[PDB]
Amino acid sequence: SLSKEKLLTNLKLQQSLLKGNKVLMKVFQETVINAGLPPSEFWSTRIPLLRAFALSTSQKVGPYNVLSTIKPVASSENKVNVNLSREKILNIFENYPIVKKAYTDNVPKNFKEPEFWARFFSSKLFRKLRGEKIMQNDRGDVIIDRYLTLDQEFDRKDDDMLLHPVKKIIDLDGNIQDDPVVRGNRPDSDGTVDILKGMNRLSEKMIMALKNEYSNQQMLQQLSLVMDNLINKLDLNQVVPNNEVSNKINKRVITAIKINAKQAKHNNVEVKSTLPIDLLESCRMLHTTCCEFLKHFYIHQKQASTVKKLYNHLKDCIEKLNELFQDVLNGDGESMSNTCTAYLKPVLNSITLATHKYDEYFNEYNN
Amino acid sequence: KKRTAKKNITPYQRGIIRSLILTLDCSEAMLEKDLRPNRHAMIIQYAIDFVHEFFDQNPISQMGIIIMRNGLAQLVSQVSGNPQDHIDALKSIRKQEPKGNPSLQNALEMARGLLLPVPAHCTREVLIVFGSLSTTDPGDIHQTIDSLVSEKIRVKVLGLSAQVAICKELCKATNYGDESFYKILLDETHLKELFNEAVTPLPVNKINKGFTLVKMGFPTRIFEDTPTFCSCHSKLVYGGYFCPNCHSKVCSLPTVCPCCDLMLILSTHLARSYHHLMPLKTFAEVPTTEKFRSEDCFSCQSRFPILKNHKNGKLLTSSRYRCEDCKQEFCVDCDVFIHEILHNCPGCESK
Amino acid sequence: MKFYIDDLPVLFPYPKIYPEQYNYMCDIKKTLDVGGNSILEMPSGTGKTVSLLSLTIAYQMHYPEHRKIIYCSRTMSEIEKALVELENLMDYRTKELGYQEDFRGLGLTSRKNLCLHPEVSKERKGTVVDEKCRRMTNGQAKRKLEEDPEANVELCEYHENLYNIEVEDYLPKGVFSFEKLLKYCEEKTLCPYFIVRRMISLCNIIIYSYHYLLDPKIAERVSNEVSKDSIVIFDEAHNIDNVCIESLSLDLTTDALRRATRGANALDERISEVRKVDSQKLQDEYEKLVQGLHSADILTDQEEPFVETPVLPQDLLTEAIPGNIRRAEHFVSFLKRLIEYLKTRMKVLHVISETPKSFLQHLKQLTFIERKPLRFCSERLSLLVRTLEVTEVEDFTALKDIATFATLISTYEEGFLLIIEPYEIENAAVPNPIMRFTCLDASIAIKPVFERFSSVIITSGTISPLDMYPRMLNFKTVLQKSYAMTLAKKSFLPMIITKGSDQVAISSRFEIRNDPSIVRNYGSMLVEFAKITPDGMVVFFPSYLYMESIVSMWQTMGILDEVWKHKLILVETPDAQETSLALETYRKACSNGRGAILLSVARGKVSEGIDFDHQYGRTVLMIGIPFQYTESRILKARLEFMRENYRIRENDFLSFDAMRHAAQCLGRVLRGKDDYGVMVLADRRFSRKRSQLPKWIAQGLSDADLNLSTDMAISNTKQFLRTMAQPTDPKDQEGVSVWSYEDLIKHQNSRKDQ
Ligand code: SF4
Ligand SMILES: [Zn+2]
Ligand SMILES: [Zn+2]
Ligand SMILES: [Zn+2]
Ligand SMILES: [Zn+2]
């Protein structure tokens, strides 16, 4: 259902996803409308998003309850378009062809919105569901009665189309009486039997629409004992415990520590030109995805010409950013230009390194 | 009177990497009144807890969250390795209320689609927190189950207060037949421990499968503060990491490099793994009258040993549950603590 | 396993065992040692079939004498159940032993479920299919075909291929269950029916329904080769007596009488035309009558016998001429008088019942037609028709009805009783007089088999009490033992929901009608269960009309909407085919996700043979307790006979029958011991019957679970379902109630040899 080339060629799906995210359509166009990337590879990066979207789309709801319910669990809202109006009616249509056909036939005239569904209440919701209305409101007229007549034999032929030769464990038919020719008695009043056949038929239709599948030692001990003694030798003058002894030594220790405190403090855990900031951000995103495609390809490998095109484009982008920095220094001056250079230093270094690495690999392959 | 596991008989293999796709259940059933707020609120709370826990103990895996509302499976968190995203997603959900019927089939198919990108060495999984007593499928299900087991996708589900035949078949099917994974609960505490035991990697007796070396590299923290600049979210962040190879900043994570796409870790994640691979022998409870050992703790120093002949009190037992290999005592609290939190056995470390 | 019974190797096909099974084996062997009957109630919660077949096969294949086994399950459904299980046992026995089999064992049902001829089997009514196969392959149409090659005569040709190859030999070696038999004999284009029917002379063990054993009209071909001494097993024997009675009763309706009039007219036409063409053969048959009963071709008939012999198998038959009936025209006139007398006696105003002797004398009064000539009417008509070689039987169906009636009422006495009900009061004051004729003593039909066979068994998962059967059937036993369900766990929750939420006693006893209190109470019960139980639930209304009305006016309320919202409904309807279809969809839904409810009738076909395993049944119900006297007084007459002949009072017998059917319904919901399931009841009267139930049911039914209200019922079953859901598998308490492989039985009871 989902394939790499399939999502690649799902152009309408791809454009729908373009409509999905402003950021997405923006980055895509600036990778395209800026004479940049063919969309093919651009999606070739983004494939999982496409797959996810596609699956989120073509997701048929079950038949089952809502399908049924559309005849039972739906007996109140006599107003306008009720809950899940289009959803419920399509569930009806898949559930019952007759109503779909009647509604279609009654489009050019007789609106099936209010009056159609009003007469439908009587006609169908007596036909299906509850007992035979027979008397009472016999509004089942015209299309209703016609479709009634139809649906009768229609359900008949369906039921006909349902009969399997059930496996002989369950075969009640062959089980009953079709062993003997016997003479019993029987004693255990029309209508409603049709009701039972109705529920059976509904359920089985539902299920079928689902089966469809659609030093050490010596000196060690010596020194140890020495210390042990020293301890035992009263001593342990906590007064004599250094305090700091050499005021100089003390000072030096403090120096070290304040130095380290300063350095680690330098860790203060706001650009000027908001419009140029956003523009530079766009440039960074652009160069990032461009390099992304190379560092994919330059690793992986026979599509060498594609790598060549990517490399030429990347060199173009590098020169473009160089000119960008030149223009920034010209216009914004230095401090703002300095801030821009700082903001773009990492990406700039990465792309420059990628360019150098490609140059080295190209020289190695050539020489 | 003891309740202990007799022995661990797969202390040789587990799935260390994981990609578990928890799927909740947000459907009309979950609104009954058996668990204190409801099924649903308690479920989501424990789900948050489990998310924290699982992303702790398996800090190299990913995860995605899936609901089942109105017979549809609507992804609520892409498969991702950052716990906070999933946590927030669950936060958002918990204020929203269930509807429709649980469409187990749709959720299953959405997962199977979702886990395709996961590479061979990574291992797949799903964890259905199934709450209802029915499904509503728009297709054959055994078709899906067959596709699943074809794609080597183990599944574990935690039913609520009943047993559903199809789910039992599902667990029995994907997990190489060996049925133990359809555990259903009978109490809230049982539920907490259910999630807890879902946290760990999952062995049964692994078939001999492909075992593959995976390229990855470790980063080095950065120094500057004002030079705040990020290459995984394109912000200003006061300092982060460097891919050793891609050589671009990446906000703090065990994430995958967003430039050259290789896994990043420090080691402490690998340390957690080590802890899971080769655990200890379960500490033995010493005989009541046959111990004649030291009257203290060993790791701690507790005074809870015995009472020396007290009709029924001494006849009860002798709190001396003592590990095997180091053969040193340990009070009950110390043994519980060792076997739960820190797995270096105190004495067995020292020799 | 392969353990011993102090002489017998037993190739039990499972590693595990059950204790009750071992006791069953011990006691059934003890029975077979010494000729007796020894009814044995083994709860269906175990596998009775496996134990039975394993032990009996081992016995037959170990000792050299009792070479044949007869197994009579109630319905062909259980026939193929026994067959498939036996096939698996056989495969296991070979697998453990190599090849020491030389074994054949065959099912045996009828043409309608066996005839493979496409067009023939396309027919629905079993009688018609029988007739069609008879004509298509008779002793006569074959002659017409062979002497006169023409388009008139065709043939299944399956009979022909049989004639070629099968009647020199047999089917290869298997114990062919109907699936296997049909597949194979379809491949090799044979007629399975005649195959097995001729094969009976060779099968080591035979399985056939009760009717083939007791219905004298088809239990004719019993060829004492079949047993003469064999060991005979009645599985599911609690419904024996009713099978006997239904095999010996008979109905009459004026409409069929007019049909017989038409048939007699057609007979007059046929005899006229043939005697115009050929009568010398008719006189030859007169001579063949005058020599004797014409057994040479009234009995030596490979294909002929037309009207079965509804009397017991030839025991109560003389052999001389039927005197004046020798003339065919005489016979037609006799039937004319008979049918007219029947019509005029049918126009009788109101209910009247007579002994057969009394009716016989009365007929003699109106028309002096004697008993002795009357008895011969059946074979007389049949062989006359053969001499007529008619082209159809439908015209003569009523004729054979009357022949059967004449033979019965002219043969037996002082056990039977006539009755002439002029109408059906349920639609009273309409023209529909019925000349109902039935037996009373169940023992009459059985008596021949207990006379013939020596070692017989009676077995069911339900029989209780184990003394009513020796009373009614008048037979001697040895071991009347009941077995207790030794369980390391509860495993099922019998209840008696006497009071609904209104705390009101409920039943079906009041009427067959509505009383919205009762209806709403039951509906509430059903719907809350539908909420609570997982997939699979059953109910068993006491009678069909009851279900019709109840469900109709449930649909009147909104009650059915809720259970629709949860589970599926699958009703039980009189046509068997649609019933089977519904039942299989029920199974398919249970094993699928959606839960499904099947509601049927206790007396009905569903309870008879259908099984309800783990998934397919969790919570049976018994809406009301099944009773019959809703309808007329045939039960009253039989019960009169019961009281006078046996020291049994009415309500005793009625309660006994009701609990018989209740237990039969209930036992279906378990198969093994791993299975489980609630078994509720519902009626006030149930509470006092707690002792009538079979033992193993009674044990689980503690005192505190009596007359519970629906609400506490739901509470308890909720707790049950949860508890059973737990994997309570200590596997050391299962060494108590499973007697593990080859050892725990060996150790435990080889020591218990005390
Ligand atoms: S036995 Fe043969 S001839 Fe007779 S009905 Fe069956 S297929 Fe036809
Ligand atoms: Zn970042
Ligand atoms: Zn990198
Ligand atoms: Zn301690
Ligand atoms: Zn230790």
Q: Which residue has the tokens 């309500």?
A: C651
Sequence-distant (≥ 6) Cβ neighbours of residue A342 within 8 angstroms:
B227, B229
Contact with chain A for residue B22, Cβ under 8 A: no
The Cα C139–Cα C120 span in angstroms is: 18
Q: How far is CA A23 from the centre of its chain?
A: 17
- A337 closest CA partner among A349, A328, A346, A348: A328
Give bridge partners of residue C420 from the DSSP assignment. Answer: C352
| Distance in Å, CA B349 to ligand 4 centroid | 16
Give the CA diameter of chain A: 125
Report CA Rg, chain B. Answer: 24
- B293 closest CA partner among B314, B313, B322, B317: B322
Please report residues of C whose CB lies closer than 8 A to that of A184.
246, 251
Compute the half-sphere exposure of residue C101: CA atoms within 13 Å on the CB side of its CA: 20
* Secondary structure class of A63 (helix, strand, coil): coil
Q: Do A346 and B231 touch (CB under 8 A)?
A: yes
Q: Which of A63, A64, A266 minimises the CB distance to B225? A: A266
Minimal C-alpha gap between A284 and chain B (Å): 8
Pairing of strands C231-235, C456-460: parallel
The Cα A327–Cα C395 span in angstroms is: 113
The Cα A152–Cα A154 span in angstroms is: 5
The Cα A100–Cα B351 span in angstroms is: 84
Note if the bond before C465 is cis, omega within 30 degrees. yes
Q: Does the CA dihedral C540-C542-C545-C547 come out positive or negative?
A: negative
Q: What atom in ligand 1 is closest to the CA of residue C193?
A: 1
Q: Which residues of A220-255 are buried (b: 16+ CB within 10 A; e: fewer)?
A: eeeeeeeeeeeeeeeeeeeeeeeeeeeeeeeeeeee
> CB under 8 Å, gap of 24 or more: what pairs does A330-338 form?
A332/A272, A332/A273, A332/A276, A335/A272, A336/A272, A336/A273, A336/A276
| Distance in Å, CA B268 to ligand 5 centroid | 24
The Cα A170–Cα C75 span in angstroms is: 12
The Cα B327–Cα B347 span in angstroms is: 8
Between the alpha carbon of residue A335 and those of residues A253, A328, C149, C268, the distances in Å are 39, 10, 118, 130
| Distance in Å, CA B240 to ligand 2 centroid | 8
Closest-CA residue of chain A to B69: A61
The Cα C17–Cα C251 span in angstroms is: 49
| Distance in Å, CA C198 to ligand 1 centroid | 14
Test the A interface: residue of C83, C564, C671 with most A CBs within 10 Å: C564
**Number of residues assigned to chain B:** 351
The Cα C590–Cα C677 span in angstroms is: 14
The Cα C533–Cα A208 span in angstroms is: 25
Please report residues of A whose CB lies closer than 8 A to that of B238.
267-269
CB C606, CB C600: distance < 8 Å: yes
Instruction: Count Cβ atoms within 10 A of the Cβ of residue C64 and give its class: 0-12 exposed, 13-18 middle, 19 or more buried.
Output: exposed
List the structure tokens of C393: 């039987």
Q: Does the CA dihedral C745-C747-C748-C752 come out positive or negative?
A: positive
**What letter represents residue C337's amino acid?**
R
**Among all ligands shown, which has an atom nearest to the Cα of B262?**
3
Minimal C-alpha gap between C484 and chain A (Å): 30
Is C98 labeled as ligand-binding? Answer: no
List the structure tokens of C509: 């006893």
Determine if residue A186 is left, alpha or beta; phi over 0 gives left, psi from -120 to 50 gives alpha, anything else beta: left
| Distance in Å, CA B68 to ligand 3 centroid | 37
Compute the count of residue pairs across chains B and C with CB atoms less than 8 Å apart: 40
Pairing of strands C481-482, C416-418: unpaired
Minimal C-alpha gap between C31 and chain A (Å): 32
Q: What atom in ligand 1 is closest to the CA of residue C121?
A: 5
Q: Which residues of C619-641 are buried (b: 16+ CB within 10 A; e: fewer)?
A: bbbbbbbbbbebbbebbebbbeb
* Secondary structure class of A255 (helix, strand, coil): helix
The Cα C538–Cα C541 span in angstroms is: 10
* Secondary structure class of C258 (helix, strand, coil): helix
The Cα C312–Cα C314 span in angstroms is: 6
Give one DSSP letter per residue of B230-255, joined into a string: -SSS-S--S--EE-TTT--EE-SSS-
Q: How far is CA C38 from the centre of its chain?
A: 21
Q: Do B114 and A52 touch (CB under 8 A)?
A: yes
* Secondary structure class of C460 (helix, strand, coil): strand
Cα angle A219, A224, A228 (rounded to 5 degrees) comes to: 145
* Secondary structure class of B69 (helix, strand, coil): strand
Please report residues of B whose CB lies closer than 8 A to that of A95.
none
Q: Do B73 and A267 touch (CB under 8 A)?
A: no
**Residue nearest atom 6 of ligand 1, based on CA coordinates:** C115
Give the CA diameter of chain C: 88
The conformation of residue C208, written as its DSSP 8-state character, comes to E
Q: Do C178 and A168 touch (CB under 8 A)?
A: yes
CB C437, CB C416: distance < 8 Å: yes
CB atoms within 10 A of CB A323: 10
**Residue nearest atom 2 of ligand 1, based on CA coordinates:** C191
CB C525, CB C597: distance < 8 Å: no
The Cα A288–Cα A290 span in angstroms is: 5
The Cα B102–Cα C627 span in angstroms is: 44
Give bridge partners of residue B284 from the DSSP assignment. Answer: B322
The Cα C530–Cα C135 span in angstroms is: 53
The Cα C650–Cα C474 span in angstroms is: 19
Please report residues of A whose CB lies closer than 8 A to that of C179.
167-168
Q: Which of A65, A176, A199 minimises the CB distance to C605? A: A176
CB atoms within 10 A of CB C63: 12
The conformation of residue C583, written as its DSSP 8-state character, comes to H
CB C339, CB C260: distance < 8 Å: yes
Give one DSSP letter per residue of A120-159, joined into a string: HHHHHHHHTTSS---SS-----THHHHHHHHHHHHHHHHH
- C727 closest CA partner among B5, B198, B180: B180
Minimal C-alpha gap between B107 and chain C (Å): 15
Give bridge partners of residue C499 from the DSSP assignment. Answer: C505, C709
Closest-CA residue of chain A to B243: A350
The Cα C459–Cα C238 span in angstroms is: 8
CB atoms within 10 A of CB B252: 12
Sequence-distant (≥ 6) Cβ neighbours of residue C22 within 8 angstroms:
C739, C745, C749
CB C16, CB C30: distance < 8 Å: no
CB atoms within 10 A of CB A330: 9
CB C580, CB A175: distance < 8 Å: yes
The Cα C38–Cα C56 span in angstroms is: 15
- C108 closest CA partner among C243, C27, C205, C34: C205
Stretch (H or E) spanning B43: helix B39-57
The Cα C620–Cα C623 span in angstroms is: 10
Q: Do A48 and B74 touch (CB under 8 A)?
A: no
Pairing of strands B75-80, B62-66: antiparallel
Q: What atom in ligand 1 is closest to the CA of residue C194?
A: 1
Q: What method was applied to determine this entry? A: cryo-EM
- C137 closest CA partner among C158, C108, C111: C158
Test the B interface: residue of C722, C724, C728, C732 with most B CBs within 10 Å: C722
CA torsion C728-C729-C731-C733 (nearest 10°) is: 20
- A122 closest CA partner among A75, A154, A162, A188: A75
**Among all ligands shown, which has an atom nearest to the Cα of C114?**
1
The Cα A171–Cα C584 span in angstroms is: 9
The Cα C709–Cα C223 span in angstroms is: 57
Give one DSSP letter per residue of C88-119, joined into a string: HHHHHHHHHHSS-----EEEE--STTT---HH
List the structure tokens of A200: 């059976």
Q: How far is CA A254 from the centre of its chain?
A: 58
Give bridge partners of residue C569 from the DSSP assignment. Answer: C597
Between the alpha carbon of residue A102 and those of residues A110, A112, C61, C329, the distances in Å are 11, 9, 71, 67
- C338 closest CA partner among C417, C410, C386: C410
Q: Do A268 and B226 touch (CB under 8 A)?
A: yes
* Secondary structure class of A213 (helix, strand, coil): coil
**Residue nearest atom 8 of ligand 1, based on CA coordinates:** C117
Among B residues 234-263, those touching chain A with beta carbons less than 8 Å apart: 234, 236, 238-239, 246-249, 259-261
Q: Do B164 and C592 touch (CB under 8 A)?
A: no
Give one DSSP letter per residue of C337-393, joined into a string: HHHHHHHHHHT-SS-B---HHHHHHHHHHHS---HHHHHTHHHHHHHHHHHHT-S-S
Give bridge partners of residue C352 from the DSSP assignment. Answer: C420
- A337 closest CA partner among A298, A254, A280, A286: A280
**Among all ligands shown, which has an atom nearest to the Cα of B218?**
3
Q: Do C595 and B135 touch (CB under 8 A)?
A: no
Stretch (H or E) spanning B337: helix B332-340
Contact with chain B for residue C592, Cβ under 8 A: yes
List the structure tokens of B191: 């539920």
CA end-to-end span of chain A, whole Å?
46
Q: Do B139 and A214 touch (CB under 8 A)?
A: yes
The Cα C606–Cα C544 span in angstroms is: 12
Q: Does the CA dihedral A203-A206-A208-A210 come out positive or negative?
A: negative
CB A273, CB A332: distance < 8 Å: yes
Secondary structure percentages of chain B, helix, strand, coil, to 5: 30, 10, 60
Q: Which residues of C506-531 are buried (b: 16+ CB within 10 A; e: fewer)?
A: bbbeeebeeeeebbbbbbbbbbbbbb
The Cα C653–Cα C309 span in angstroms is: 32
Report CA Rg, chain A. Answer: 42
CA torsion A321-A322-A326-A327 (nearest 10°) is: -20
Strand C596-601: give its sheet, edge to edge. Answer: C537-541, C596-601, C568-571
All partners of chain A with 3 or more CB pairs under 8 angstroms: B, C
Q: Do C576 and A207 touch (CB under 8 A)?
A: no
List the structure tokens of A192: 């409603």
Pocket test for ligand 1, best of C131, C156, C303 (most atoms within 8 A of CB): C156
The Cα A58–Cα C523 span in angstroms is: 41
Q: Which residues of B32-46 are buried (b: 16+ CB within 10 A; e: fewer)?
A: eeebeebbbebbbeb
Minimal C-alpha gap between A62 and chain C (Å): 13
Is C619 labeled as ligand-binding? Answer: no
Closest-CA residue of chain B to C720: B162
List the structure tokens of C357: 């002797």
Between the alpha carbon of residue C246 and those of residues A187, C27, C130, C145, C602, the distances in Å are 14, 32, 21, 40, 18
Q: Which residue has the tokens 């190379």?
A: A294
Sequence-distant (≥ 6) Cβ neighbours of residue C465 within 8 angstroms:
C656, C692
Give bridge partners of residue C107 from the DSSP assignment. Answer: C207
Q: Which residues, judged by CB distance below 6 Å to any ligand atom, belong to the binding site of ligand 1? A: C 111, 114-117, 120, 133, 136-137, 156, 158-159, 191, 193-194
CB C534, CB C595: distance < 8 Å: yes
**Number of residues assigned to chain A:** 367
Q: Do C80 and A188 touch (CB under 8 A)?
A: no
Instruction: Count Cβ atoms within 10 A of the Cβ of residue A116 and give its class: 0-12 exposed, 13-18 middle, 19 or more buried.
Output: middle
- The values of phi and psi at residue C165, to 5°, are -115, -40
List the structure tokens of C546: 């009851």
Between the alpha carbon of residue C264 and those of residues A31, C22, C251, C261, C327, the distances in Å are 100, 61, 19, 5, 15
The Cα A204–Cα C338 span in angstroms is: 52
Is C136 labeled as ligand-binding? Answer: no
Q: Where are the beta strands (DSSP E) in B176-240?
A: 216-217
Q: Where are the beta strands (DSSP E) in C155-259?
A: 205-208, 231-235
Q: How far is CA A203 from the centre of its chain?
A: 34
Stretch (H or E) spanning B20: strand B19-23
Compute the count of residue pairs across chains A and B with CB atoms less than 8 Å apart: 87
Closest-CA residue of chain B to C568: B134
CB A97, CB A124: distance < 8 Å: no
Please report residues of B whose CB lies closer than 8 A to that of C727.
183
The Cα A195–Cα C663 span in angstroms is: 31
The Cα C259–Cα C402 span in angstroms is: 10
- Cite the DSSP H helix spans in C15-47: 19-33
The conformation of residue B28, written as its DSSP 8-state character, comes to G
The conformation of residue B281, written as its DSSP 8-state character, comes to P
CB atoms within 10 A of CB B153: 21
Among C residues 21-80, those touching chain A with beta carbons less than 8 Å apart: 75-77, 80
- Cite the DSSP H helix spans in C533-622: 544-556, 559-566, 576-591, 605-609
Q: Which residues of C76-93 are buried (b: 16+ CB within 10 A; e: fewer)?
A: bbbbbbbbbbbbebbeeb
CB C696, CB C663: distance < 8 Å: no
CB C71, CB C205: distance < 8 Å: yes
Minimal C-alpha gap between C611 and chain B (Å): 18
Give bridge partners of residue C208 from the DSSP assignment. Answer: C108
